Write a protein that holds these residues in place. Structure first.
Motif, short mmCIF file in Angstrom:
data_model
loop_
_atom_site.label_atom_id
_atom_site.label_comp_id
_atom_site.label_asym_id
_atom_site.label_seq_id
_atom_site.Cartn_x
_atom_site.Cartn_y
_atom_site.Cartn_z
N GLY A 19 11.99 -24.06 -46.95
CA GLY A 19 11.05 -25.02 -47.49
C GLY A 19 10.00 -24.36 -48.36
N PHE A 20 9.00 -25.17 -48.72
CA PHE A 20 7.91 -24.74 -49.58
C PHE A 20 6.58 -24.96 -48.88
N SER A 21 5.68 -23.99 -49.04
CA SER A 21 4.34 -24.10 -48.45
C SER A 21 3.40 -23.22 -49.27
N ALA A 22 2.53 -23.85 -50.05
CA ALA A 22 1.56 -23.11 -50.85
C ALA A 22 0.53 -22.44 -49.95
N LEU A 23 0.07 -21.26 -50.38
CA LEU A 23 -0.90 -20.47 -49.64
C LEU A 23 -2.26 -20.58 -50.32
N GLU A 24 -3.27 -21.03 -49.57
CA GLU A 24 -4.60 -21.14 -50.16
C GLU A 24 -5.35 -19.81 -50.03
N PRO A 25 -6.22 -19.50 -50.99
CA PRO A 25 -7.01 -18.27 -50.89
C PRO A 25 -7.93 -18.28 -49.68
N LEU A 26 -8.11 -17.11 -49.09
CA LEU A 26 -9.03 -16.94 -47.97
C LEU A 26 -10.27 -16.14 -48.34
N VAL A 27 -10.12 -14.99 -48.99
CA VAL A 27 -11.28 -14.15 -49.29
C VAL A 27 -10.99 -13.32 -50.52
N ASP A 28 -12.06 -12.93 -51.23
CA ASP A 28 -12.00 -12.04 -52.39
C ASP A 28 -13.08 -10.98 -52.20
N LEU A 29 -12.71 -9.87 -51.56
CA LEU A 29 -13.66 -8.80 -51.28
C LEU A 29 -13.87 -7.93 -52.52
N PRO A 30 -15.10 -7.78 -53.01
CA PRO A 30 -15.38 -6.82 -54.10
C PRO A 30 -15.49 -5.39 -53.60
N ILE A 31 -14.34 -4.75 -53.38
CA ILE A 31 -14.31 -3.40 -52.83
C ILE A 31 -14.01 -2.40 -53.94
N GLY A 32 -12.85 -2.54 -54.58
CA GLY A 32 -12.47 -1.65 -55.66
C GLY A 32 -12.12 -0.25 -55.21
N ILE A 33 -11.01 -0.11 -54.48
CA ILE A 33 -10.55 1.18 -54.00
C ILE A 33 -9.08 1.35 -54.37
N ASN A 34 -8.63 2.60 -54.39
CA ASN A 34 -7.25 2.93 -54.71
C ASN A 34 -6.40 2.81 -53.45
N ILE A 35 -5.43 1.91 -53.48
CA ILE A 35 -4.54 1.66 -52.35
C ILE A 35 -3.10 1.77 -52.84
N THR A 36 -2.33 2.63 -52.18
CA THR A 36 -0.92 2.83 -52.52
C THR A 36 0.03 2.66 -51.35
N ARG A 37 -0.43 2.82 -50.11
CA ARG A 37 0.39 2.65 -48.93
C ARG A 37 -0.37 1.82 -47.90
N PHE A 38 0.37 1.14 -47.03
CA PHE A 38 -0.25 0.31 -46.01
C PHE A 38 0.62 0.29 -44.77
N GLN A 39 -0.01 0.01 -43.63
CA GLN A 39 0.67 -0.08 -42.35
C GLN A 39 0.13 -1.28 -41.59
N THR A 40 1.01 -1.91 -40.82
CA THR A 40 0.63 -3.06 -40.01
C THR A 40 0.19 -2.62 -38.62
N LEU A 41 -0.65 -3.45 -38.00
CA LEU A 41 -1.17 -3.19 -36.66
C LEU A 41 -0.69 -4.29 -35.72
N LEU A 42 -0.12 -3.90 -34.59
CA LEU A 42 0.33 -4.86 -33.59
C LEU A 42 -0.13 -4.40 -32.21
N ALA A 43 -0.31 -5.37 -31.32
CA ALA A 43 -0.82 -5.12 -29.98
C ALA A 43 0.34 -5.06 -28.98
N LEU A 44 0.35 -4.02 -28.16
CA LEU A 44 1.36 -3.86 -27.13
C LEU A 44 0.87 -4.43 -25.80
N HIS A 45 1.77 -4.46 -24.82
CA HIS A 45 1.50 -5.02 -23.51
C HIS A 45 1.66 -3.95 -22.44
N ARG A 46 0.72 -3.93 -21.48
CA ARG A 46 0.77 -3.00 -20.37
C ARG A 46 0.46 -3.74 -19.08
N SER A 47 0.98 -3.22 -17.97
CA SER A 47 0.77 -3.83 -16.66
C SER A 47 0.98 -2.80 -15.55
#
Ligand SMILES: *[C@@H]1O[C@H](CO)[C@@H](O[C@@H]2O[C@H](CO)[C@@H](O)[C@H](O)[C@H]2NC(C)=O)[C@H](O)[C@H]1NC(C)=O
Lengths: 47, 43
Positions: A19-47
């Protein structure tokens, strides 16, 4: 640095919803940095 | 132009609203309606 966001309820098990679902803007941070790689963060479970 | 109450719904990230011809139609919400104008003929 622009973040556009959207949330949806889906009722599949393991797939990419079709299907189709348009994405609305959330934020526009005025940072201005060089970014070439990225990694995701996920939470694990312990007991 | 003339500022009019607008029934159009603007999203929070939207400031201006343009119709066909990419001209300004609404500004944050007030619709822009150019005031009366036309031609004048003499009979
Ligand atoms: C962001 O940093 C990367 C470094 O990982 C830059 O990539 C290098 O840029 C230099 C020029 O300054 C080149 O000589 C290297 O060959 C580039 N290496 C790679 C792997 O691309 C990148 O240019 C930087 N970008 C900005 C906009 O500063």
């Amino acid at each position: 640095f622009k973040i556009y966001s959207k949330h949806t309820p889906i009722n599949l098990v393991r797939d990419l919803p079709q299907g189709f679902s348009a994405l609305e803007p959330l934020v526009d941070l005025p940072i201005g940095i060089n970014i070439t790689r990225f990694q995701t963060l996920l939470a694990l479970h312990r007991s | 132009g003339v500022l009019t109450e607008s029934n159009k719904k603007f999203l929070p990230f939207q400031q201006f609203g343009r119709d066909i011809a990419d001209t300004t139609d609404a500004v944050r919400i007030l619709d822009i309606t150019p005031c009366s104008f036309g031609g004048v003929s003499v009979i």
